Amino acid sequence: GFVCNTCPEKWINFQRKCYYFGKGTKQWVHARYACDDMEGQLVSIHSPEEQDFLTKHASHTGSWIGLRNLDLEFIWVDGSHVDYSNWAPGEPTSRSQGEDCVMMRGSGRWNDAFCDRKLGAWVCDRLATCTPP
């Protein structure tokens, strides 16, 4: 096994991951289950290179991402902590209470909005399968 760029039908390869750029009106939790029932998760961005690819295919309206708030601290759906951050200027707002779910704007910048908000786009990500040369 050396080459990891093997994608299922309708998924787009980037680096060592597969991405599905889903459409249709969905609440954060609804988009959380849309990927889980597809054998994927809501997207976890960890590199500027990943973000740049994501921005290129993402809908201008705004896509849900796998980041959310708790208590403590923002953590991705995979459980990973935030290392790379592409927050919009002045984000995350530490006064807007209830805005615990993160979305990604057309520009790629992330905004933290209400979980009950209906967005037209949502991005999923899974691991890319391998091939032995």
Q: Give the type of residue at 117.
A: R
* Residue 39 backbone dihedrals phi, psi, to 5 degrees: 65, 45
Decide if 100 contacts 112 (C-beta within 8 A): yes
Place of tokens 């993160």: 102
Residue 28 DSSP symbol = H
Q: Report resolution (Å) to 1 decimal.
A: 3.2
Instruction: Output the CA torsion 71→40→31→42 (10° steps).
Output: 50
Q: Are 112 and 102 in contact (CB under 8 A)?
A: yes
Q: Which of 55, 29, 51, 52 is nearest to 42 (CA)?
A: 29
DSSP string across 36-76: HTTT-EE----SHHHHHHHHHHS-SS-EEEEEEE----EEE
Encoded tokens for 22: 């889903």
- Binding residues for Ca(2+) are 91, 93, 111-112
Annotated binding site: 91, 93, 111-112
Q: What are phi and psi of 90, to 5 degrees?
A: 90, 10
DSSP letters, 76-129, are ETTSPBPSS--BPTT-S-SS-TT--EEEE-TTS-EEEE-TT--EEEEEEEEEPE
Q: Measure the CA–CA gap between 119 and 24, rounded to whole angstroms.
A: 8
Is residue 71 exposed (0-12), middle (13-18) or buried (19+ Cβ within 10 Å)?
A: exposed
Q: Residue 21 has what DSSP assignment? A: E
The string of DSSP letters for 29-40 reads: HHHHHHHHTTT-
Pairing of strands 63-69, 119-127: parallel
Instruction: Please give the method by which this entry was determined.
Output: X-ray
Q: Is 20 helix (H, G, I), strand (E, B) or coil?
A: strand
Say which residue the tokens 């896509």 belong to: 63
SS3 at position 9: coil
Beta bridge partners of 3: 131
**Residue type, position 78, single letter:** D
State the Cα–Cα distance between residues 60 and 82, nearest whole angstrom. Answer: 24
Distance (Å, whole) CA 16 – CA 21: 17
Domains in the chain, please, with CATH?
11-128 (3.10.100.10)
